[PDB]
Amino acid sequence: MVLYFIGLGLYDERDITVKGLEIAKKCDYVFAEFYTSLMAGTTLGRIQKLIGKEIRVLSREDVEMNFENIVLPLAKENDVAFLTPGDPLVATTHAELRIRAKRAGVESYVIHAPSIYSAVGITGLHIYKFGKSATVAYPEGNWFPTSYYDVIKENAERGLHTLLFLDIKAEKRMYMTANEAMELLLKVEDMKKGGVFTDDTLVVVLARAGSLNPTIRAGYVKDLIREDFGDPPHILIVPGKLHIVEAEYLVEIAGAPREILRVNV
Amino acid sequence: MVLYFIGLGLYDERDITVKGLEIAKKCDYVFAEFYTSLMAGTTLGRIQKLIGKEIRVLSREDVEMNFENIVLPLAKENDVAFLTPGDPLVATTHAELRIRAKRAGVESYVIHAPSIYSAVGITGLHIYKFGKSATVAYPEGNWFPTSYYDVIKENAERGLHTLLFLDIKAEKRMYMTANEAMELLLKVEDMKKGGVFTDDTLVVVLARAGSLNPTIRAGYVKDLIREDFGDPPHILIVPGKLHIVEAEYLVEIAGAPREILRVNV
Numbered sequence: 001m002v003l004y005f006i007g008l009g010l011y012d013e014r015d016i017t018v019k020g021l022e023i024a025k026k027c028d029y030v031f032a033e034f035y036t037s038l039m040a041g042t043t044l045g046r047i048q049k050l051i052g053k054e055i056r057v058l059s060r061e062d063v064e065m066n067f068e069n070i071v072l073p074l075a076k077e078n079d080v081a082f083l084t085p086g087d088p089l090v091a092t093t094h095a096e097l098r099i100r101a102k103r104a105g106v107e108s109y110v111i112h113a114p115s116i117y118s119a120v121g122i123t124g125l126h127i128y129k130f131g132k133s134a135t136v137a138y139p140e141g142n143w144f145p146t147s148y149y150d151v152i153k154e155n156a157e158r159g160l161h162t163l164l165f166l167d168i169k170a171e172k173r174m175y176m177t178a179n180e181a182m183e184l185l186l187k188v189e190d191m192k193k194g195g196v197f198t199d200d201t202l203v204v205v206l207a208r209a210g211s212l213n214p215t216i217r218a219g220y221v222k223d224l225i226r227e228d229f230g231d232p233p234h235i236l237i238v239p240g241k242l243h244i245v246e247a248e249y250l251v252e253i254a255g256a257p258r259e260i261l262r263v264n265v
Numbered sequence: 266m267v268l269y270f271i272g273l274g275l276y277d278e279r280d281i282t283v284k285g286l287e288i289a290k291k292c293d294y295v296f297a298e299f300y301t302s303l304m305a306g307t308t309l310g311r312i313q314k315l316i317g318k319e320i321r322v323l324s325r326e327d328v329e330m331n332f333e334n335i336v337l338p339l340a341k342e343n344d345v346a347f348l349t350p351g352d353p354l355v356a357t358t359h360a361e362l363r364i365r366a367k368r369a370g371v372e373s374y375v376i377h378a379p380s381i382y383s384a385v386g387i388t389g390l391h392i393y394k395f396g397k398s399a400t401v402a403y404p405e406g407n408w409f410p411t412s413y414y415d416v417i418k419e420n421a422e423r424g425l426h427t428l429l430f431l432d433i434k435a436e437k438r439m440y441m442t443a444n445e446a447m448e449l450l451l452k453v454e455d456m457k458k459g460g461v462f463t464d465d466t467l468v469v470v471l472a473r474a475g476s477l478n479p480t481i482r483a484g485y486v487k488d489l490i491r492e493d494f495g496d497p498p499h500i501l502i503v504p505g506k507l508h509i510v511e512a513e514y515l516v517e518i519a520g521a522p523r524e525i526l527r528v529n530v
C-alpha cells in the first residue's frame with residue numbers, strides 16, 4: 001500500500017543512499033526512469049544487480065501520462081519503488097506525481113539522494129550565491145529560444161551565479177557538451193548583444209559529478225571553448241562576481257588562471 | 266595517504282550514500298563535525314556502529330583553526346575521512362579546507378550526500394525557480410542582522426522563491442525554529458516596512474527533511490507563526506509567483522488554504 005520515490009544519486013550505482021537501497025530491496029515492484037537524466041557512470045544491469053530486483057524502465061510518456069495506470073495500481077497491494085537519477089522531485093514535473101498518488105489513495109514517501117543542485121558545491125562557489133537556474137536548449141527549425149541567456153543576465157546583474165543544465169537527448173543518448181553550450185551562448189550574444197556571454201566571460205565546467213575523479217575546470221571562454229572536458233554529462237556555470245575565497249578555490253582546485261584573483265573579484 | 270570529505274545526509278545514518286559507506290569503512294582515521302547542521306534522527310553511536318570506526322568529533326574551532334594540525338597530518342600517511350551532516354560543501358565553508366589539504370600536499374576527494382538545498386523539491390516548489398538564498402541569524406546583543414530580509418525582497422521582485430537556512434549554535438544545543446524565524450522577520454518588517462514579510466505573506470516550512478515523515482506545511486504567517494512543526498532542524502521558504510501546479514501541491518500535500526489556488530498572474 002506504499003509508493004517510494006527513491007533517488008539514485010549522481011553518477012553510478014553506489015550513489016544511491018543506504019536507506020534507499022535497503023528500502024528498494026524490500027519492495028515488490030521497482031520502476032525507474034532515465035529520460036530526465038542518465039546514470040553515465042553505470043548501467044541498468046549494475047543497478048538491478050545491486051538491488052536484486054527486476055527494474056521496469058518507464059518512458060516520459062509512461063510517467064507523465066500513465067503513472068496512475070502503470071505504477072499506482074500495484075502500490076495498492078504492494079510496496080512499490082520508483083527510481084530516478086539524482087534527488088526525487090527535483091525534475092520539475094515529478095512533485096505532481098505525489099498528488100496523483102494521494103488521489104489514488106496511495107501513501108508515498110520520499111527517499112533523497114545527491115543532486116547536481118547541491119553537488120555543484122564542489123566547484124567552490126557558495127551555494128547561497130546561485131540565482132535562478134536554466135537549461136541551454138538546441139535551436140531547431142524556426143525556433144531559436146534564448147531565455148537561458150536572459151537568466152544569466154538577471155543573475156549576474158545581481159552578483160549571483162547561474163547553474164546551466166545542458167540539453168539532453170535521453171533516448172538517442174545525445175548529450176550537449178559544455179563546448180557546444182558555449183558556442184550557442186556566443187551566438188546568442190551576437191544577436192542580443194547584451195554583453196552577457198563573450199570570450200572574456202569566466203565560466204566553470206563540472207563533469208561527472210559524483211565520480212571520485214570529476215572534471216572541474218574554470219577559465220575564460222576563449223580558452224575553454226575548445227578544451228576537452230571528457231565524457232558527459234557536462235554542467236555549465238556562469239559565475240557572478242566572485243568572493244576572494246571562491247576565486248582561490250577555482251585557482252587551486254579547478255586550475256583557473258591566477259588572473260581571476262583581480263579581474264573577477 | 267588521502268583525505269575524504271564524506272557527507273552523512275539529512276536525517277539519520279542511512280542517508281549516507283553507499284559509496285560513502287564503503288569508503289568510510291576502509292579509512293584508517295575518521296573525523297567529523299556536527300555544528301554545521303542537525304541530524305535529528307541518529308546518534309554518534311549509531312554512525313560509529315554503521316561505519317565500524319570510532320569517530321573523533323571536532324568543534325568549529327578545531328576545524329576552522331586547527332584542521333591542518335589535527336586532520337591533515339594523518340592524511341599524509343593514512344586514509345582519512347572527514348564526515349559532516351548533509352553535503353559537506355553546501356552552506357558551509359568546508360570547501361576552503363580542500364585548499365589547505367592541497368597546500369599540505371594532501372589529495373582530497375568529495376563524496377556527496379543528500380542536502381537540504383535539493384530536498385526543497387519535496388515542498389512542491391520548482392527548484393529552478395529558487396533565487397539567492399540567505400540565513401536567518403540570531404540577533405547578538407545589540408547587533409541585529411537583517412540582510413536576509415533584502416534577499417527575500419530581491420527574489421520576490423523577480424518572482425523567485427527564497428530558501429532560508431535557519432541559524433544554529435550547536436555548542437548550546439540551540440536550533441532556530443521556523444516560528445522563531447518568522448518572529449525575527451516580522452520584527453525586521455516593522456523596522457523597514459518594505460511590505461516584504463507580513464502576517465499575510467505565504468510561507469512554507471520543511472522540518473526534518475530526510476525522515477520518512479517530514480513536516481511539510483504551507484500557509485499565511487499569521488496562521489503558521491505559532492503552529493508546532495516538530496523538532497528541528499527547520500528551514501523557512503518564502504515563495505515568489507507560483508505556478509498553478511506548485512499551488513496545487515502546496516494545497517494537496519502541504520495543507521495550504523485552497524485560497525492560494527487562485528493565483529494572481
Ligand SMILES: Nc1ncnc2c1ncn2[C@@H]1O[C@H](CSCC[C@H](N)C(=O)O)[C@@H](O)[C@H]1O
Nearest residue numbers: 275302351352355380381431473474498499
Ligand atoms: N533535514 C533537514 N531539515 C530541515 N532543515 C535542514 C535539514 N538539514 C539542514 N537544514 C537546514 O540547514 C541548516 C544547516 S546549513 C548546512 C547544510 C548542509 N551542508 C546540507 O547539505 O543540508 C539548518 O540549521 C537548517 O535550517
Ligand code: NA
Nearest residue numbers: 130131392395
Ligand atoms: Na538554486
